[PDB]
Structure 1
């Protein structure tokens, strides 16, 4: 989830349905709010974030997070000669090293798999379709 930090002040004390305060971290990412697109300081809080910090307590590492400029996670694209450019999106940042590690909801597939190592799945899910339910079925006469 993305909300900007209120002024300079950082993150809301907002609480989960089970009484716990919601954890949060700062992330620099694309903003469409301004007409031009600046890489904007933002507050982001998530399942993947709680997981990341869980690791961070478990793991020796420290973390700084910024959202990828492209809204897309990644896909191979661009120029014809040799193999040219690289898949646009956060994955591309990973190979480029813009981010050394990618934490997001990323499905795991072989085409990507040859290029990079993949962590064991935190989640197991498959594709599906969303369609509105409501087609009904009102007087004692009926």
Structure 2
């Protein structure tokens, strides 16, 4: 209520995930190393709400999931819980596991789970078909939202997909493995749409499934949630979110 963001210095959790965030590894310092749709959102928020900021990446370079053995979190989620950051500024997918530990902002993009495949010959119509064959290998990225959704799905055959697939390290590793062929990568619609635009030999496996949002992550009891929510709703209403997606997402297709 009384507390606002004017003069505050926010620590923002993020990682590279194109086209939401691009991180330059040389030739830059501080905030200048970052660009993309989410960066443009943060810049505008900072101008309108009067805060300064920096970005902090988790050492493990994970988005974050809950380990059922240890009952601990990792990734950006863990950094937020540990007060290393004040908000997670990325395409942070909404899931119930995360919601048990943190809050979300007002959301800015509907998304679904999408499976894609590279391979000549017989192909697949739905991901559970993977369990009854050995032509294709498959995987999800460890400690990221799709893995969490598949592992918590009430049809435990989706847990089988995770347990019996390859645990991919990160998006680059996953895309490199997909491009190697005879592989199904199960991830998120907007991320795959952008990043695989010029992969003319990569195709869909069925339709998208599951419904969720991208939002920012906030700690429970954050004094800044109401302001962030209001300003994100305004960005959506003014058309700013759509304008940024057009600016940053890939167009055409050599294919």
**TM-score, normalised with respect to structure 2:** 0.35
Q: Which residue of 2 aligns with 1:71?
A: 61
Matched, 1:101 2:91: no
Q: State the SS of the aligned residue for 1:72.
A: coil
Query: What is the distance in 2 between the residues matched to 1:114 and 1:123?
Result: 21
Do the aligned partners of residues 77 and 55 (structure 1) sit closer, same or farther apart at CA in structure 2, a change above 3 Å counting?
same
Q: Partner residue of 1:129?
A: 115
The CA deviation string for residues 51-94 of structure 1, in whole angstroms up to 9 with x for no partner, is: 011111111221111222112111112755xx5xx201110000
Cα separation, 1, equivalents of 2:116 and 2:61: 22
Deviation at 1:127, TM superposition (A): 0.9
Q: Which residue of 2 aligns with 1:110?
A: 96
Equivalent position to 2:73, from 75, 87, 90: 87
Deviations 1:25-44 (A, max 9, x none): 24xxxxxxxxxxxxxxxx22
Give the structure 2 partner of residue 4 of structure 1: 25
Secondary structure of 2:63's aligned partner = coil
Greater percentage in helix: 2
Q: Note if contact 2:66-2:97 (Cα within 8 Å) is conserved in structure 1.
A: no
> Could you say what secondary structure the match of 1:105 adopts?
strand
In the aligned structure 2, how far is the partner of 1:124 from the partner of 1:131? 23
Distance 2:25 2:78 in 1: 25
- Structure 1 equivalent of residue 35 of structure 2: 45
Q: Which runs of 5+ in 1 are unaligned?
A: 12-23, 27-42, 135-142
TM-score normalised over the length of structure 1? 0.61
SS in 1 for 2:101: coil
**What is the aligned-residue RMSD (CA, Å)?**
2.2
User: Corresponding residue for 2:47?
Assistant: 57
* Count of matched residue positions in the alignment of Structure 1 and Structure 2: 99
Question: Which of 1 and 2 has greater Rg?
Answer: 1
Uncovered stretches (5+) of structure 2, i.e. residues with no partner:
1-21, 119-199, 202-255
Moved runs in structure 1, 4+ residues, more than 4 A? none
Cα distance in structure 1, aligned partners of 2:66 and 2:108 = 25
